[PDB]
């Protein structure tokens with residue numbers, strides 16, 4: 031299905047690219063998107079797929095568009111095909127006054143000060159889950175670590191007890207995974223009805239957990255409503271879930287095939303923070319965009335009001351004009367440049383929590399399972415979309431090579 | 436190179452900042468919670484507001500158009516030496532710069 035070409039799009043800017051099914055996907059989703067950056071491809075192309083839309087292919091244009099509040103919206107017109115990924119827990123009709131107040135409140139919950147204080151417990155959580163898999167010699171990293179880890183981290187933030195683990199895991203599973211006979215609204219409402227009694231409870235006698243901070247927040251000089259509070263908690267739980275899960279799987283897939291990169295981090299663990307930033311560049315996975323709010327000539331291309339323009343966050347770091355040899359993973363890379371968490375006023379508010387989860391994951395995994403690889407005869411399949419991902423990551427190792435810590 | 440962050444209560448935070456790192460990134464990476472840096476450093480949020488010491492104001496590169504229009508949104512008092520510290524990139528010429536951190540960014 032290919033949409034008609036708008037009258038203002040010249041033929042030479044038309045490029046064959048389906049963001050949900052790119053042609054070279056078997057080489058890896060990042061590589062599949064990099065066909066947009068081959069030598070003969072314009073910096074700004076139009077694709078007939080998915081209703082027709084622009085794609086900026088270079089970091090320079092991607093950064094400028096996200097900064098240019100005059101002609102580019104702040105909200106994304108690209109609706110994810112899945113119902114769960116399309117829901118905005120904080121409505122899109124909000125004004126900049128309310129947008130700032132919600133960013134402020136989310137910053138009280140997952141900002142850098144909070145991540146520092148909780149790092150020791152995030153460390154204990156990673157160790158507990160990895161040590162639980164260490165003697166098995168096998169695991170589906172996606173299902174057995176990548177998915178439980180950030181869910182459990184939300185429970186630490188939100189002060190939730192451990193006996194709620196299977197229920198909250200099951201509920202987030204109904205929302206994120208389209209498989210299963212339950213609509214997203216029913217799963218989302220089921221999530222809400224788990225939060226409402228704890229929200230109403232901690233509104234009277236609060237504490238300093240995430241739910242208490244949100245329940246006691248103020249919006250427009252008055253207490254935050256119960257509806258606003260449950261939406262905030264739902265956003266904080268399921269907002270980051272897919273990208274964290276998939277990025278960890280991208281990173282661990284690469285380390286499973288890269289013994290020399292593992293040994294580099296085992297011998298010199300002080301380089302794990304730098305290595306995490308290089309993995310964030312190389313395995314960037316978000317590809318969203320904006321919509322034109324007025325006609326604008328952008329880098330010599332006529333854009334019209336209402337045109338959808340994809341501004342893939344993942345392409346900025348893969349751009350050879352930004353990072354030489356962009357497919358090379360160099361933990362000593364001098365000037366790591368990317369927009370993996372986005373760019374501009376809506377940059378990921380979970381960026382600090384996300385970086386800490388990656389650094390602790392690599393630290394605690396390589397200490398206990400320093401050597402591992404893909405299960406033989408396994409076919410790792412990538413998926414492409416607004417959030418690209420890994421279907422499954424079967425890993426195997428020899429338990430005698432592991433070290434309990 | 437060395438940067439000193441003076442909090443609102445007079446507390447001093449003397450910090451060694453690498454060449455090429457913004458004053459926001461250094462603060463955020465080193466427990467200086469009084470600097471938020473919500474937008475990640477692209478002059479898009481005004482949550483990295485700091486007051487530059489008058490000794491170093493004429494040495495640091497001046498503010499561009501985006502920083503000034505963004506500085507209008509600071510929640511603390513906007514002073515003529517107010518800067519967005521994510522636009523202040525550390526160079527050895529700025530060794531010893533002192534910045535006063537407002538009582539609020541949000």
Ligand code: HEM
Pocket residue numbers: 140265266267269270271273274277315316343370371372373374375376377378379380381383384
């Ligand atoms: C590897 C991990 C992650 C990556 C790559 C990532 C990337 C992104 C990107 C590209 C955006 C859009 C930025 C923009 O529109 O300018 C975003 C927004 C957002 N992220 Fe993440 N993120 C990650 C982890 C997390 C985590 C752990 C949380 C925890 C709460 C989170 C919560 C959010 C929220 C709520 C938004 C919406 C921000 C807004 O609309 O103002 N993310 N993220």
Ligand SMILES: *[C@H]1CC(=O)N(CCCCCCN2C(=O)CCC2=O)C1=O
Pocket residue numbers: 364365366454455526
């Ligand atoms: C960090 C990454 C990058 O490309 N870059 C600019 C390149 C020149 C800066 C390197 C030389 N240098 C220092 O090492 C400190 C100050 C300086 O100019 C970065 O700054």
Ligand SMILES: CC1(C)[C@@H]2CC[C@@]1(C)C(=O)C2
Pocket residue numbers: 110114115116117268269270272273316318416417
């Ligand atoms: C598309 C999403 C639902 C997914 C999680 C939050 C969201 C808006 C993203 O930017 C990634």
Ligand code: FES
Pocket residue numbers: 459471472473474475476477478479480481482483505519520521522
């Ligand atoms: S960090 Fe957002 S403006 Fe300085």
Ligand SMILES: [C-]#N
Pocket residue numbers: 269270271273378
């Ligand atoms: C963000 N997901």
Ligand SMILES: [Ca+2]
Pocket residue numbers: 219223
């Ligand atoms: Ca109900």
